[PDB]
Amino acid sequence: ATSTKKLHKEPATLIKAIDGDTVKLMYKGQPMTFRLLLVDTPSTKHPKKGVEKYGPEASAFTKKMVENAKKIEVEFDKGQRTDKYGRGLAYIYADGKMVNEALVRQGLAKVAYVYKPNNTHEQLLRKSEAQAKKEKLNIWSEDNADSGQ
């Protein structure tokens, strides 16, 4: 144990946001498609239901935060650097805000089956998910999941 600086950030710039959990950015002068991996968004392409535009969904959320970002950094984990489908596996930081956590904490993304050993910030997302759940944020909001009394 005993480590300084959790994981490693590499400089990036957005080319296009494919959707919420999958983006294509310019990684060191070359276009690489990245998937956030730990997070998985529901109904990925369209709003949850579609009755008025309540919920810009992860697609626009990720897009907006990375476009407004001064700095875009991709943080690669301890495991594999790229996904089975050749997507980059990194925690993308938009302006220093980790997109993964931001999607989850606001309730636009859920924690999925994280492909270990790529899991350093799984815990962070897990708590942020639980956070979103107890506040019934947009994907946890009374619609698909309408639980209570």
PDB file of C-alpha atoms in Angstrom:
ATOM      1  CA  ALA A   1       0.000   0.000   0.000  1.00  0.00           C
ATOM      2  CA  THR A   2       1.035   3.648   0.423  1.00  0.00           C
ATOM      3  CA  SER A   3       0.457   5.583  -2.766  1.00  0.00           C
ATOM      4  CA  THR A   4       0.563   9.180  -3.848  1.00  0.00           C
ATOM      5  CA  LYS A   5      -1.821  10.484  -6.564  1.00  0.00           C
ATOM      6  CA  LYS A   6      -4.674   8.147  -7.276  1.00  0.00           C
ATOM      7  CA  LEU A   7      -4.403   6.772 -10.847  1.00  0.00           C
ATOM      8  CA  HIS A   8      -3.120   8.805 -13.800  1.00  0.00           C
ATOM      9  CA  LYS A   9      -4.593  11.595 -15.839  1.00  0.00           C
ATOM     10  CA  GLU A  10      -3.771  12.091 -19.412  1.00  0.00           C
ATOM     11  CA  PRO A  11      -4.742  15.245 -21.407  1.00  0.00           C
ATOM     12  CA  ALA A  12      -7.715  15.073 -23.765  1.00  0.00           C
ATOM     13  CA  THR A  13     -10.098  17.241 -25.780  1.00  0.00           C
ATOM     14  CA  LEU A  14     -13.655  16.371 -26.902  1.00  0.00           C
ATOM     15  CA  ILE A  15     -14.341  15.570 -30.530  1.00  0.00           C
ATOM     16  CA  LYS A  16     -17.873  14.359 -30.115  1.00  0.00           C
ATOM     17  CA  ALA A  17     -19.959  13.054 -27.375  1.00  0.00           C
ATOM     18  CA  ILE A  18     -21.505   9.890 -28.706  1.00  0.00           C
ATOM     19  CA  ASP A  19     -23.850   9.658 -25.832  1.00  0.00           C
ATOM     20  CA  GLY A  20     -23.734   9.855 -22.040  1.00  0.00           C
ATOM     21  CA  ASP A  21     -21.407   7.015 -21.133  1.00  0.00           C
ATOM     22  CA  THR A  22     -19.616   6.790 -24.457  1.00  0.00           C
ATOM     23  CA  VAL A  23     -17.657   9.684 -25.932  1.00  0.00           C
ATOM     24  CA  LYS A  24     -15.110  10.155 -28.599  1.00  0.00           C
ATOM     25  CA  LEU A  25     -12.387  12.487 -27.812  1.00  0.00           C
ATOM     26  CA  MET A  26      -9.065  13.489 -29.061  1.00  0.00           C
ATOM     27  CA  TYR A  27      -6.604  11.693 -26.986  1.00  0.00           C
ATOM     28  CA  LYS A  28      -3.114  13.108 -27.520  1.00  0.00           C
ATOM     29  CA  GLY A  29      -3.935  14.053 -31.075  1.00  0.00           C
ATOM     30  CA  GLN A  30      -5.777  10.863 -31.999  1.00  0.00           C
ATOM     31  CA  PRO A  31      -9.527  10.119 -31.789  1.00  0.00           C
ATOM     32  CA  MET A  32     -10.381   7.500 -29.242  1.00  0.00           C
ATOM     33  CA  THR A  33     -13.766   6.296 -28.206  1.00  0.00           C
ATOM     34  CA  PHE A  34     -14.042   5.989 -24.437  1.00  0.00           C
ATOM     35  CA  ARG A  35     -16.629   4.345 -22.318  1.00  0.00           C
ATOM     36  CA  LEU A  36     -16.948   5.209 -18.659  1.00  0.00           C
ATOM     37  CA  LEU A  37     -17.497   1.432 -17.899  1.00  0.00           C
ATOM     38  CA  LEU A  38     -18.506   1.717 -14.213  1.00  0.00           C
ATOM     39  CA  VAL A  39     -21.551   3.702 -15.114  1.00  0.00           C
ATOM     40  CA  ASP A  40     -24.347   2.615 -17.367  1.00  0.00           C
ATOM     41  CA  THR A  41     -27.094   4.930 -18.420  1.00  0.00           C
ATOM     42  CA  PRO A  42     -30.755   3.842 -19.003  1.00  0.00           C
ATOM     43  CA  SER A  43     -32.645   4.479 -22.311  1.00  0.00           C
ATOM     44  CA  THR A  44     -29.296   5.708 -23.734  1.00  0.00           C
ATOM     45  CA  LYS A  45     -30.319   7.905 -26.764  1.00  0.00           C
ATOM     46  CA  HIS A  46     -33.614   9.309 -25.591  1.00  0.00           C
ATOM     47  CA  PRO A  47     -35.168  10.780 -22.385  1.00  0.00           C
ATOM     48  CA  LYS A  48     -36.687   8.211 -19.890  1.00  0.00           C
ATOM     49  CA  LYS A  49     -40.196   8.527 -21.244  1.00  0.00           C
ATOM     50  CA  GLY A  50     -40.524  11.666 -23.307  1.00  0.00           C
ATOM     51  CA  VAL A  51     -43.382  13.671 -21.834  1.00  0.00           C
ATOM     52  CA  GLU A  52     -41.838  17.139 -22.210  1.00  0.00           C
ATOM     53  CA  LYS A  53     -38.156  17.690 -21.976  1.00  0.00           C
ATOM     54  CA  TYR A  54     -37.530  16.929 -18.376  1.00  0.00           C
ATOM     55  CA  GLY A  55     -34.272  15.299 -18.265  1.00  0.00           C
ATOM     56  CA  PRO A  56     -31.595  16.173 -20.828  1.00  0.00           C
ATOM     57  CA  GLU A  57     -30.226  12.741 -20.075  1.00  0.00           C
ATOM     58  CA  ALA A  58     -26.645  11.672 -19.814  1.00  0.00           C
ATOM     59  CA  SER A  59     -26.170  12.304 -23.547  1.00  0.00           C
ATOM     60  CA  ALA A  60     -26.455  16.059 -23.188  1.00  0.00           C
ATOM     61  CA  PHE A  61     -25.280  16.172 -19.579  1.00  0.00           C
ATOM     62  CA  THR A  62     -21.901  14.608 -20.348  1.00  0.00           C
ATOM     63  CA  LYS A  63     -21.679  16.665 -23.523  1.00  0.00           C
ATOM     64  CA  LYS A  64     -22.338  20.000 -21.765  1.00  0.00           C
ATOM     65  CA  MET A  65     -19.940  19.412 -18.901  1.00  0.00           C
ATOM     66  CA  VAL A  66     -17.069  18.359 -21.153  1.00  0.00           C
ATOM     67  CA  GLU A  67     -17.672  21.222 -23.649  1.00  0.00           C
ATOM     68  CA  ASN A  68     -17.621  23.808 -20.848  1.00  0.00           C
ATOM     69  CA  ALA A  69     -14.600  22.123 -19.397  1.00  0.00           C
ATOM     70  CA  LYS A  70     -11.381  24.027 -19.622  1.00  0.00           C
ATOM     71  CA  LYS A  71      -9.487  20.884 -19.110  1.00  0.00           C
ATOM     72  CA  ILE A  72     -10.448  17.417 -20.060  1.00  0.00           C
ATOM     73  CA  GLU A  73      -8.380  14.722 -18.450  1.00  0.00           C
ATOM     74  CA  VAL A  74      -8.780  11.023 -18.796  1.00  0.00           C
ATOM     75  CA  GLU A  75      -7.797   8.993 -15.752  1.00  0.00           C
ATOM     76  CA  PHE A  76      -6.823   5.439 -16.536  1.00  0.00           C
ATOM     77  CA  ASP A  77      -7.355   2.814 -13.815  1.00  0.00           C
ATOM     78  CA  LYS A  78      -5.123   0.013 -12.415  1.00  0.00           C
ATOM     79  CA  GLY A  79      -6.410  -2.671 -14.758  1.00  0.00           C
ATOM     80  CA  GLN A  80      -6.778  -2.610 -18.483  1.00  0.00           C
ATOM     81  CA  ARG A  81      -6.478   0.601 -20.412  1.00  0.00           C
ATOM     82  CA  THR A  82      -8.964  -0.295 -23.105  1.00  0.00           C
ATOM     83  CA  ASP A  83     -12.260  -2.126 -23.287  1.00  0.00           C
ATOM     84  CA  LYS A  84     -12.920  -5.386 -25.158  1.00  0.00           C
ATOM     85  CA  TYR A  85     -14.435  -3.322 -27.997  1.00  0.00           C
ATOM     86  CA  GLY A  86     -11.415  -1.027 -28.142  1.00  0.00           C
ATOM     87  CA  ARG A  87     -12.892   1.795 -26.128  1.00  0.00           C
ATOM     88  CA  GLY A  88     -10.726   3.619 -23.665  1.00  0.00           C
ATOM     89  CA  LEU A  89     -11.368   2.869 -20.037  1.00  0.00           C
ATOM     90  CA  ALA A  90     -10.818   6.017 -18.151  1.00  0.00           C
ATOM     91  CA  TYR A  91     -12.450   8.239 -15.668  1.00  0.00           C
ATOM     92  CA  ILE A  92     -12.960  11.373 -17.578  1.00  0.00           C
ATOM     93  CA  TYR A  93     -12.559  14.581 -15.674  1.00  0.00           C
ATOM     94  CA  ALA A  94     -14.249  17.548 -17.163  1.00  0.00           C
ATOM     95  CA  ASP A  95     -12.768  20.736 -15.751  1.00  0.00           C
ATOM     96  CA  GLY A  96     -11.703  18.612 -12.822  1.00  0.00           C
ATOM     97  CA  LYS A  97     -15.182  17.258 -12.264  1.00  0.00           C
ATOM     98  CA  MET A  98     -15.228  13.513 -12.732  1.00  0.00           C
ATOM     99  CA  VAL A  99     -18.026  12.864 -15.277  1.00  0.00           C
ATOM    100  CA  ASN A 100     -18.677   9.361 -13.886  1.00  0.00           C
ATOM    101  CA  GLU A 101     -19.617  10.653 -10.492  1.00  0.00           C
ATOM    102  CA  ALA A 102     -21.490  13.651 -11.838  1.00  0.00           C
ATOM    103  CA  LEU A 103     -23.789  11.470 -13.976  1.00  0.00           C
ATOM    104  CA  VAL A 104     -24.438   9.140 -11.100  1.00  0.00           C
ATOM    105  CA  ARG A 105     -24.806  11.691  -8.261  1.00  0.00           C
ATOM    106  CA  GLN A 106     -27.398  13.616 -10.212  1.00  0.00           C
ATOM    107  CA  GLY A 107     -29.215  10.428 -11.020  1.00  0.00           C
ATOM    108  CA  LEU A 108     -28.673  10.075 -14.780  1.00  0.00           C
ATOM    109  CA  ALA A 109     -26.483   7.010 -14.576  1.00  0.00           C
ATOM    110  CA  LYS A 110     -26.437   3.874 -12.501  1.00  0.00           C
ATOM    111  CA  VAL A 111     -23.541   1.811 -11.322  1.00  0.00           C
ATOM    112  CA  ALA A 112     -23.264  -1.222 -13.498  1.00  0.00           C
ATOM    113  CA  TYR A 113     -21.216  -4.361 -13.472  1.00  0.00           C
ATOM    114  CA  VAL A 114     -17.866  -2.744 -13.230  1.00  0.00           C
ATOM    115  CA  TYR A 115     -15.262  -4.726 -15.013  1.00  0.00           C
ATOM    116  CA  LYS A 116     -12.788  -5.350 -12.288  1.00  0.00           C
ATOM    117  CA  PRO A 117      -9.931  -4.908 -11.772  1.00  0.00           C
ATOM    118  CA  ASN A 118     -10.867  -1.496 -13.282  1.00  0.00           C
ATOM    119  CA  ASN A 119     -12.348  -0.164 -10.136  1.00  0.00           C
ATOM    120  CA  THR A 120     -10.771   2.550  -8.151  1.00  0.00           C
ATOM    121  CA  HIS A 121     -13.662   4.977  -8.022  1.00  0.00           C
ATOM    122  CA  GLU A 122     -16.426   2.321  -8.044  1.00  0.00           C
ATOM    123  CA  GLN A 123     -16.923   3.090  -4.328  1.00  0.00           C
ATOM    124  CA  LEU A 124     -17.348   6.777  -5.103  1.00  0.00           C
ATOM    125  CA  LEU A 125     -19.971   6.063  -7.709  1.00  0.00           C
ATOM    126  CA  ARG A 126     -21.659   3.537  -5.492  1.00  0.00           C
ATOM    127  CA  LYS A 127     -22.207   6.114  -2.772  1.00  0.00           C
ATOM    128  CA  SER A 128     -23.177   8.757  -5.307  1.00  0.00           C
ATOM    129  CA  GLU A 129     -25.727   6.256  -6.716  1.00  0.00           C
ATOM    130  CA  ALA A 130     -27.184   5.622  -3.272  1.00  0.00           C
ATOM    131  CA  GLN A 131     -27.256   9.387  -2.871  1.00  0.00           C
ATOM    132  CA  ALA A 132     -29.274   9.794  -6.052  1.00  0.00           C
ATOM    133  CA  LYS A 133     -31.602   7.012  -4.929  1.00  0.00           C
ATOM    134  CA  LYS A 134     -32.528   8.605  -1.608  1.00  0.00           C
ATOM    135  CA  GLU A 135     -33.281  11.946  -3.262  1.00  0.00           C
ATOM    136  CA  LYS A 136     -35.249  10.243  -6.064  1.00  0.00           C
ATOM    137  CA  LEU A 137     -33.292  12.105  -8.716  1.00  0.00           C
ATOM    138  CA  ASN A 138     -34.446  11.952 -12.384  1.00  0.00           C
ATOM    139  CA  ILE A 139     -33.819   8.205 -13.146  1.00  0.00           C
ATOM    140  CA  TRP A 140     -34.802   7.264  -9.592  1.00  0.00           C
ATOM    141  CA  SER A 141     -37.695   9.669  -9.677  1.00  0.00           C
ATOM    142  CA  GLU A 142     -41.216   8.325  -9.560  1.00  0.00           C
ATOM    143  CA  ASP A 143     -41.818   6.853 -13.016  1.00  0.00           C
ATOM    144  CA  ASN A 144     -39.909   3.701 -13.855  1.00  0.00           C
ATOM    145  CA  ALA A 145     -39.305   3.245 -10.217  1.00  0.00           C
ATOM    146  CA  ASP A 146     -42.289   4.458  -8.260  1.00  0.00           C
ATOM    147  CA  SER A 147     -41.797   3.023  -4.884  1.00  0.00           C
ATOM    148  CA  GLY A 148     -42.985   4.403  -1.621  1.00  0.00           C
ATOM    149  CA  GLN A 149     -46.186   4.340   0.296  1.00  0.00           C
TER     150      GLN A 149
END
